[PDB]
Amino acid sequence: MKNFSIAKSRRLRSTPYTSRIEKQGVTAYTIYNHMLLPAAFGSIEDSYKHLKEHVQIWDVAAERQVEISGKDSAELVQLMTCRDLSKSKIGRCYYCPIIDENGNLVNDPVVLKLDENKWWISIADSDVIFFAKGLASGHKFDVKIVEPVVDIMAIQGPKSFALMEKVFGKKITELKFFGFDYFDFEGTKHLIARSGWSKQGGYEVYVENTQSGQKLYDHLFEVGKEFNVGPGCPNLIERIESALLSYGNDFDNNDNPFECGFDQYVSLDSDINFLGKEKLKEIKLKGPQKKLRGVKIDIKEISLTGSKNIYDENNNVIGELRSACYSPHFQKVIGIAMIKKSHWEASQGFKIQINDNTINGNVCDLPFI
Amino acid sequence: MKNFSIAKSRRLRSTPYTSRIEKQGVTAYTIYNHMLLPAAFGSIEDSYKHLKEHVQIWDVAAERQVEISGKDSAELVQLMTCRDLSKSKIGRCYYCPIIDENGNLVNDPVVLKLDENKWWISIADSDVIFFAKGLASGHKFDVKIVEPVVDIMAIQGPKSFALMEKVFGKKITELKFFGFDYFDFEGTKHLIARSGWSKQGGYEVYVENTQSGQKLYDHLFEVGKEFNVGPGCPNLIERIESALLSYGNDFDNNDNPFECGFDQYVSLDSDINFLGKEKLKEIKLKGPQKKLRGVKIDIKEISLTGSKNIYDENNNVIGELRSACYSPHFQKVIGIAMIKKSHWEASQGFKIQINDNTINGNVCDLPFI
Ligand SMILES: Nc1nc2c(c(=O)[nH]1)N[C@@H](CNc1ccc(C(=O)N[C@@H](CCC(=O)O)C(=O)O)cc1)CN2
Numbered sequence: 012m013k014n015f016s017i018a019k020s021r022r023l024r025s026t027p028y029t030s031r032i033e034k035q036g037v038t039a040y041t042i043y044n045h046m047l048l049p050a051a052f053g054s055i056e057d058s059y060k061h062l063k064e065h066v067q068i069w070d071v072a073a074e075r076q077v078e079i080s081g082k083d084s085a086e087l088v089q090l091m092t093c094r095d096l097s098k099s100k101i102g103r104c105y106y107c108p109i110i111d112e113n114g115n116l117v118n119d120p121v122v123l124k125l126d127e128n129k130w131w132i133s134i135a136d137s138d139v140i141f142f143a144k145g146l147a148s149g150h151k152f153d154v155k156i157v158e159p160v161v162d163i164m165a166i167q168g169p170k171s172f173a174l175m176e177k178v179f180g181k182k183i184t185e186l187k188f189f190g191f192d193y194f195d196f197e198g199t200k201h202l203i204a205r206s207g208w209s210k211q212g213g214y215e216v217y218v219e220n221t222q223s224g225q226k227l228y229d230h231l232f233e234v235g236k237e238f239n240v241g242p243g244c245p246n247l248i249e250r251i252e253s254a255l256l257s258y259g260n261d262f263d264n265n266d267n268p269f270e271c272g273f274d275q276y277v278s279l280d281s282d283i284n285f286l287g288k289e290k291l292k293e294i295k296l297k298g299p300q301k302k303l304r305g306v307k308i309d310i311k312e313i314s315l316t317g318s319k320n321i322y323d324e325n326n327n328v329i330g331e332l333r334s335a336c337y338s339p340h341f342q343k344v345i346g347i348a349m350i351k352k353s354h355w356e357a358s359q360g361f362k363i364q365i366n367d368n369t370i371n372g373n374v375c376d377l378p379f380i
Numbered sequence: 381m382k383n384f385s386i387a388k389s390r391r392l393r394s395t396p397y398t399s400r401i402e403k404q405g406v407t408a409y410t411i412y413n414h415m416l417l418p419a420a421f422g423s424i425e426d427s428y429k430h431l432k433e434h435v436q437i438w439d440v441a442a443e444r445q446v447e448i449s450g451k452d453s454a455e456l457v458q459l460m461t462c463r464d465l466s467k468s469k470i471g472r473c474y475y476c477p478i479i480d481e482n483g484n485l486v487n488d489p490v491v492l493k494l495d496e497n498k499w500w501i502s503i504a505d506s507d508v509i510f511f512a513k514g515l516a517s518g519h520k521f522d523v524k525i526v527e528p529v530v531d532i533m534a535i536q537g538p539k540s541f542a543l544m545e546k547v548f549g550k551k552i553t554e555l556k557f558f559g560f561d562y563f564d565f566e567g568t569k570h571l572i573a574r575s576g577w578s579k580q581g582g583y584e585v586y587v588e589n590t591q592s593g594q595k596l597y598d599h600l601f602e603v604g605k606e607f608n609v610g611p612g613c614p615n616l617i618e619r620i621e622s623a624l625l626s627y628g629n630d631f632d633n634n635d636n637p638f639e640c641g642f643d644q645y646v647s648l649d650s651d652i653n654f655l656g657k658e659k660l661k662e663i664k665l666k667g668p669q670k671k672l673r674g675v676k677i678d679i680k681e682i683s684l685t686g687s688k689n690i691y692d693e694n695n696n697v698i699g700e701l702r703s704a705c706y707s708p709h710f711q712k713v714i715g716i717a718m719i720k721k722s723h724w725e726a727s728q729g730f731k732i733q734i735n736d737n738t739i740n741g742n743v744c745d746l747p748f749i
């Protein structure tokens with residue numbers, strides 16, 4: 012078979028939105044944090060054009076929360092990330108690389124400061140919950156760690172602002188990027204952040220009152236018709252163009268923040284303790300020997316399922332292509348590659364095999380646009 | 381909406397066997413430890429009948445290892461589990477429930493004792509590696525923790541013994557259940573355990589020398605025609621009939637081992653140090669308020685994708701059905717359910733609404749067969 016079906020089970024968790032999206036045209040799934048995440052609603056290029064011009068409602072429930080509350084909750088959150096949260100404020104979100112004893116990436120969540128003693132870690136695809144539980148047990152921290160009943164619905168695209176203002180009024184229009192607050196829908200208060208995994212604008216509703224969230228989802232579709240609302244999901248083209256990086260795809264637990272472009276989030280000259288601070292000082296002094304870069308490849312199609320080596324002019328491996336797609340903007344294939352320091356330079360040439368032919372590419376900066 | 385395609389990416393990791401199985405009729409995948417695990421090679425019933433009669437070779441590379449080595453390794457491994465490993469022997473495997481600060485299940489791995497200071501933890505679907513790393517950081521344990529390059533291939537079914545003897549000769553016939561040793565294939569030594577996720581007999585080859593394991597895979601198909609060898613995968617029907625439990629399906633991180641039938645593996649009266657030991661003591665003294673039980677249901681079809689409530693005659697929830705299938709042995713649907721203390725007794729009747737029919741069922745003992 013060309014395509015393979017996904018085998019559902021309790022373990023591949025469904026979401027509060029599954030039954031809806033399956034009547035709205037979902038065509039493919041991925042699995043993210045042991046949960047169904049839509050991967051396509053038909054054509055990826057059509058979804059991309061629609062996202063950049065209208066507004067979409069997304070089931071991103073698979074962006075699970077790790078809730079850490081209690082006396083030592085701030086310190087435990089800080090312990091896991093190289094980002095300095097000492098001046099963090101309630102009502103703000105923070106992109107926080109989580110690192111291990113080697114200084115290597117575990118996850119790249121968004122952290123929400125709900126209170127000094129209550130934090131939500133909105134995670135990429137790894138079981139941060141068990142990292143946090145292990146750390147807390149070993150450090151004898153006085154915290155409570157749970158995966159709360161939170162199921163994010165995102166509203167993304169340039170008409171997200173107009174749609175959300177229609178539903179919630181003027182107060183939501185004051186919400187700054189990466190801020191959050193609480194908004195009433197039909198008597199129920201929901202936490203809503205201005206965030207999401209696109210650079211096309213919008214919001215993430217952190218649904219705790221599940222039935223009210225399901226009704227809000229339906230209401231967004233009913234009153235969003237004038238904005239050409241449609242279902243959607245994180246878009247491969249958009250996210251590669253925007254260089255929105257994906258744990259497990261572009262970087263993994265063998266990479267450190269300096270190999271990923273996370274330099275601005277590694278706080279080494281402050282007094283905070285975090286895992287691997289250690290080794291991260293050593294890595295920053297010497298400099299990385301590999302780094303994520305963009306590539307352009309002159310061909311019109313690709314289906315990347317895993318890493319592909321890229322090669323030099325002497326057929327020595329000089330990097331690894333990790334994410335890729337056809338970009339209508341460039342009218343060629345673009346992608347994200349971990350490249351050796353020999354071939355870093357924007358415009359450096361390389362060779363790659365697609366099917367059984369050697370095809371030329373060039374290295375470029377991120378983001379692409 | 382009926383079946384949905386899986387969307388492949390680097391993050392949904394492929395295995396050393398992917399290219400082979402995709403020429404051998406794989407039709408459906410699940411995701412297990414962020415890795416492709418085959419779910420079907422066409423009809424599940426036909427796969428079931430074949431496994432019960434003959435022999436299958438399985439890609440179960442998604443059964444990842446956590447390797448913990450060094451001076452404090454034995455201690456860290458024991459810290460994670462309620463099972464007493466104090467008299468553990470090199471060359472043996474042990475079923476070892478992994479427990480958190482609440483006494484709840486994180487994973488139900490098989491632990492292989494390679495040396496006093498080298499342990500492999502063969503895991504179910506959760507990121508045990510990060511639990512280990514967290515604990516090790518807090519305790520400042522002198523350990524190395526890695527996910528090694530190990531990609532299990534299983535050989536399962538009543539003809540597995542004869543096929544393996546064919547390849548490896550008499551000495552493999554000496555291997556006892558849950559034992560392992562090293563066996564030469566074409567000059568490469570492979571760790572082989574008598575284990576696997578069926579009750580139909582066989583082995584798991586812990587392939588480290590990937591190229592050699594791939595050659596072995598091919599060789600088993602070539603020499604296994606005598607035994608009607610075929611490809612396959614863990615089988616829903618067989619595993620429910622055999623009462624083999626799956627983390628994330630039958631039990632999860634809100635359940636403790638006394639709710640799951642793991643009592644024999646919980647060591648409370650020895651001197652071992654592990655997480656939640658106090659709380660398991662508290663919990664054992666009250667007794668569980670819910671437990672896993674078997675059910676039989678009077679219909680011939682089901683497609684279970686999540687928990688389904690099961691009811692008494694006056695419409696109160698008495699439990700949650702978590703895994704189910706049609707069983708050709710029973711000529712009816714069977715399953716595994718978390719049932720409330722009020723309604724455990726074998727033979728207790730219940731009702732379940734499936735679409736337009738209320739269907740009768742009853743509670744029963746595990747295992748079924
Ligand atoms: N809830 C929420 N949770 C998340 C994601 C999200 O999407 N929203 N995405 C995954 C984690 N990855 C990212 C990647 C990028 C961003 C993001 O939005 N980044 C801004 C960072 C802004 C900043 O640095 O302050 C950027 O322009 O790069 C957020 C999460 C999983 N967790």
Ligand SMILES: Nc1nc2c(c(=O)[nH]1)N[C@@H](CNc1ccc(C(=O)N[C@@H](CCC(=O)O)C(=O)O)cc1)CN2
Binds near residue numbers: 474504505558
């Ligand atoms: N490598 C290996 N690793 C594993 C699995 C496996 O399948 N093999 N399976 C997953 C964990 N679950 C199980 C469930 C049952 C068994 C099993 O085999 N149980 C015997 C227990 C025998 C004993 O306790 O000694 C039984 O008959 O119930 C093994 C792993 C993930 N890790």
Ligand code: NA
Binds near residue numbers: 049074
């Ligand atoms: Na989701």
Ligand code: NA
Binds near residue numbers: 415416439442
């Ligand atoms: Na696998």
